[PDB]
Design brief:
This protein is an all-beta fold. It has a single domain (3-221), classed as Green Fluorescent Protein (Beta Barrel), CATH 2.40.155.10. The protein is built from 1 helix and 11 strands; from the N terminus they run βββαββββββββ. An 11-stranded mixed beta barrel has the order 1-2-3-11-10-7-8-9-4-5-6. It is globular and about 45 Å long. It is classed as fluorescent protein.
């Protein structure tokens, strides 16, 4: 299917153009994903200077087509079946007591690479908030995601919460709203509702002088 394109190790390119309170920036990313394991290995550079926001606020925004699916729900795999043409992923991310992110992204094959391209627009942030002020720990608290089919739009929708640890205590709620629609016209499998479970570990490349983020991840559905 499109699922056939994920049977081996696939390389991933991630490119991000972003603007948060008029602070423009660019993130690029590359690595591999192996869906038989729901494994991702990826490194991100801010290619414009310093990242104007904490890295763990871009993890969600920076590939659910790599989740491992059981054989009994191979077919409820919308993400893989929209390949190679891909899908649009849109989100509104609400940071409690602060501004909000708006993102549009196209995940699609380009040659043999899985490409995730992102427009990120962020407005209304406080300049000494936990975000612009860089007051967030470099670690992640993942959260499951409930995938709901959207028959009208032919894709999926989901709303989940992510909790970011605040330096010195506390938690910064990030309210996620997400809809995906396919880009092609090729009949696409619409899933039954189901969960994506993710585990993310952030680290650093001791040799990398630019502002970066090393990301290892597993995601699996059930």
């Amino acid at each position: 299917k499109g699922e056939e394109l994920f049977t081996g190790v696939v390389p991933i390119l991630v490119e991000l153009d972003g603007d948060v309170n008029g602070h423009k920036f660019s993130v690029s990313g590359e690595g591999e994903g192996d869906a038989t394991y729901g494994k991702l290995t990826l490194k991100f550079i801010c290619t414009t200077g310093k990242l104007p926001v904490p890295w763990p606020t871009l993890v969600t925004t920076l590939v659910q087509c790599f989740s491992r699916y059981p054989d009994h729900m191979k077919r409820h795999d919308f993400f893989k079946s929209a390949m190679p043409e891909g899908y649009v992923q849109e989100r509104t991310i609400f940071f409690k007591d602060d501004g909000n992110y708006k993102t549009r992204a196209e995940v699609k094959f380009e040659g043999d690479t899985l490409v995730n391209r992102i427009e990120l627009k962020g407005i209304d942030f406080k300049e000494d908030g936990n975000i612009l002020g860089h007051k967030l720990e470099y670690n992640y608290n993942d959260h499951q995601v409930y995938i709901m089919a959207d028959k009208q739009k032919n894709g999926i929708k989901a709303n989940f919460k992510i909790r970011h640890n605040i330096e010195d205590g506390g938690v910064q709620l990030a309210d996620h709203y997400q809809q995906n629609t396919p880009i092609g016209d090729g009949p696409v499998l619409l899933p039954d509702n189901h969960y994506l479970f993710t585990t993310s570990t952030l680290s650093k490349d001791p040799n990398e002088k630019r502002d970066h983020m090393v990301l290892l991840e597993f995601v699996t559905a059930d």
